[PDB]
RNA sequence: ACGAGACUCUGGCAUGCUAACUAGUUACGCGACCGGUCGGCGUAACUUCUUAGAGGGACAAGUGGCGUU
């Protein structure tokens, strides 16, 4: 999790599921940022990946759903427009001068 | 102008109460050369409520689920209606339904009481609106409860509907149904 | 079942609120000042949010909206706060002062002045109303 | 000064005077855009029945028109739309000729010059490319023309060599010539942006603003700034006019004009009766359209209802 | 000759093919006047007829609508005669003549031309049918 | 911080072993 | 059983278990002295004028 | 912050597809008959149905009533 909070991601959760101790098996997850569960923007926008682990007491299951940021191969940079999401560019707002006269050159 | 030939006209329909105008639509554009035309009034906000007297005749007849597969068997009916009424009286169909069913129908009709009841009824001043609507209903149940399943030639039986409808004549069921109905109205009186 | 959702409003709000000049009735208007400073990335969106704002205008004319905050507005309420009347409200030519009051302002060393003016007070002395 | 009086009501049109560049045409036939997704027309009969009757629906188009322009002969002309088609309207048939694609990005209109030769409109989709009827680019204007967005670029039918300015949304405005091909000065340190605006033909005076309804008139002949004066509210319109020195700005309920003897408000001179297309907002107005000799004036509103100024005195 | 209004309803495939004669519109190889349902006709004869003759004599239009259904070419003639009256008069007579002839064929029809997208609609999982599902639970 | 004896007593806070782990804890 | 051009200035909602009865209070046209509420099932919008047929019996409760 | 909504696919809506031998077709070369078998070479403008195949907008530049407006 500290990793992928490192990698850029806005969001990442996973899971580990089946025995950690003892004979019952736990499903303990952490989960940290955003993560969206619905919608048509889970398949673009989440990652995710089931992997097993063999073990002494049996398999465990591991997984792992990542959110991407908005703009291809992991933020760049705004590019051509392929708007995806909602977004609130706030730019440089005009500055006055304070002198009364006007520049000189 | 247009009218029906060169032998009827449809420009004989004044009743002058100046309460049709609220809901029985024909203030401004509402009219029509054509007695049906697709309406797609489903679609819109509830704008269905400004319905004429010709569609409720087209639209609340059917049996059940019986008739539909075809709205060309609707306009049939309305078309043979125009002129199989306008051959039982000579002159404009719908003028003459309406002079027939206003004389009766429904003076006080099924309503209930209060915010629940069904052991009684109450004798509600009918609306103009409704009680024209209800009243081509009845005639229109009650056309397909004598012309169908009817035990006589069925090319009279408009007129026994008309005199079911209107005169009264023991015959058909849902008048004596509606009997019942007038004798709770009465005896809210 | 038209309620709008809050990123609806939000972003009409923060629309209205920040480019007023621009907008006025319409929504390709809208759709500009989107897609140069905030990008929306829908269309069902877009037509929302022109709707919200065609009735925040529609609001907005009649008085200022709670949620929103225009230089315009601002302008001329800031003008009605720093409004000074021509003749003070306070600088009355005569007061009208009840007895106890008066002997009072006898006991500041104020009683001298000439622009007080001693006022019969209440005849009864009943003022609480009745228990019940 | 003048005293006028309204004749005539208006009753057949739901078009406005959204953006007409200045041209001299006959006062019979005139033509304009609306956000109908159609193209009107200005035929006159001075009569109550019809105010204006338009005299062919140029069909073929299926988005609003934001500039369309008929050249004083009726088989020259220029449009626009919101995607930015370029066609070819006929006024005999009101059929489409022709296709190109005309505006890169929806601009308020087409530029304009002394020479009308140079065909290029304001896009921001930085991605400059040169327009031409016979569909072959000489060369490309890519550069020291359109630093920033281009608002509108104003007729230049003065009696000197020709000087033209492009005017923009970003505070700037530029002068061009064909014989100087080069960037003199650049303006900047408005308060607000930009909307829309005019110019002078002759390059002497430059009017900007917007953001507030106040025209700073810069001075191109050095490139320095000559002053600002106070014109209307926040519009699209704040037009110096070429043929009248007066000001004339739609604000609030009333067309304001300022004449040269105080600079003040004088005279009203309306006689039109209220609207429930009235009832909300005060009407703005987006552009003006003056007659070639003096005389006519063609103002549009928010209010659905175009207004005119007409010498007839009946 | 090109007005390019067409006339479609419902899923019918129609053509309006335009080029100056009398208006006829040929179903099934029966003409106008003489019509396949043979039920609906004086629905459709009424509002032409009446007025005139020769009032479709201005431009001919092949009107070979392949419609099956009673409801699918019964009012299709007729929204091809509305439509194909309505444009010839728009682009080659006037904008006065425009004005009335549309007053009277709104007059004939005030707002019922186009539609929102619908038709039947699908079945689910579970049940026989779009809104039905199996044994019920009383 | 150990997290093996967390981990065992976040399993199972009333275990068999609840109490070992908790006590392990303190300290 | 009164016939007149009843001006309804008063119509309030509908109420009860199935819906369609609407409390239509029902005032006469110029009389300005007696009004009547009454259910009835069926659309009578805000501002018709109803057809008096019956001035009693007033919607019933309980 | 997650869910809901937004989102995606889908449905009796388009006179631009500088669009098509499967679908008719402005001026060719077929042609009885009161500008057509040029869809029986193939119209380079097509397009109207068909391709629901690719690019679009229009519930508020609305009205009345109820509601703390």
Known sequence: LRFIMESGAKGCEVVVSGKLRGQRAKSMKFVDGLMIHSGDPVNYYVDTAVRHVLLRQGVLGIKVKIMLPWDPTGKIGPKKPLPDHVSIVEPKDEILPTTPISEQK | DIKLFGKWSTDDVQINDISLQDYIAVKEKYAKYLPHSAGRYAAKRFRKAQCPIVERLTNSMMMHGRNNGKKLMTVRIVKHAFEIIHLLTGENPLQVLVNAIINSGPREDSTRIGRAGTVRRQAVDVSPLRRVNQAIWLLCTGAREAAFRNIKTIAECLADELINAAKGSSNSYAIKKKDELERVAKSNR | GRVRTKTVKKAARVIIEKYYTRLGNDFHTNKRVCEEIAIIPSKKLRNKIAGYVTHLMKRIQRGPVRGISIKLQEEERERRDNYVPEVSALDQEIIEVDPDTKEMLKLLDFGSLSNLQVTQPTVGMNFKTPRG | ?314 | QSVQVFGRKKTATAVAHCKRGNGLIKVNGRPLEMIEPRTLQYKLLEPVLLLGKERFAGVDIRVRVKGGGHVAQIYAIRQSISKALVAYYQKYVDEASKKEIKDILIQYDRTLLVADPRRCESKKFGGPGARARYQKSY | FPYEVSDALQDDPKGKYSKKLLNKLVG | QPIKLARVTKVLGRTGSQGQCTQVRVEFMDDTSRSIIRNVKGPVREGDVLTLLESEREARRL
């Open chain 4, 1 to 314: 000064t003048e005293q006028m009086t309204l004749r005539g009501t208006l009753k057949g049109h739901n078009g406005w005077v959204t953006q007409i560049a200045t041209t001299p045409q006959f006062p019979d036939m005139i033509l304009s855009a609306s956000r109908d997704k159609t193209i009107i027309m200005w035929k006159l009969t001075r009569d109550e029945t019809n105010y204006g009757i338009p005299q062919r629906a140029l069909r073929g188009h299926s988005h609003f028109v934001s500039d369309v322009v008929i050249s004083s002969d009726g088989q020259f002309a220029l449009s626009g739309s919101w995607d930015g088609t370029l066609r070819l309207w006929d006024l005999t048939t009101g059929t489409t000729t022709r296709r190109f694609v005309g505006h890169t990005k929806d601009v308020l209109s087409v530029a304009f010059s002394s020479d009308n030769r140079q065909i290029v409109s304001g896009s921001r989709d930085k991605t400059i490319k040169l327009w031409n009827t016979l569909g072959v680019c000489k060369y490309t204007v890519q550069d020291e023309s359109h630093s920033e967005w281009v608002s509108c670029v104003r007729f230049s039918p003065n009696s000197s060599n020709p000087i033209i300015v492009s005017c923009g949304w970003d505070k700037l405005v530029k002068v061009w010539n064909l014989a100087n091909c080069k960037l003199k000065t650049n303006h900047i340190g408005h308060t607000g942006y930009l909307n829309t605006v005019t110019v002078s033909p002759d390059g002497s005076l430059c009017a900007s603003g917007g953001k507030d309804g106040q025209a700073m008139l810069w001075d191109l002949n050095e490139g320095k700034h000559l002053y600002t004066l106070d014109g209307g509210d926040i519009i699209n319109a704040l037009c110096f006019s070429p043929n009248r020195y007066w000001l004339c700005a739609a604000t609030g309920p009333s067309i304001k004009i300022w004449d040269l003897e105080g600079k003040i408000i004088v005279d009203e001179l309306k006689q039109e009766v209220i609207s429930t297309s009235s009832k909300a907002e005060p009407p703005q107005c987006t552009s003006l359209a003056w007659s070639a000799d003096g005389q006519t004036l063609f103002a549009g509103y928010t209010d659905n209802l175009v207004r005119v100024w007409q010498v007839t005195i009946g």
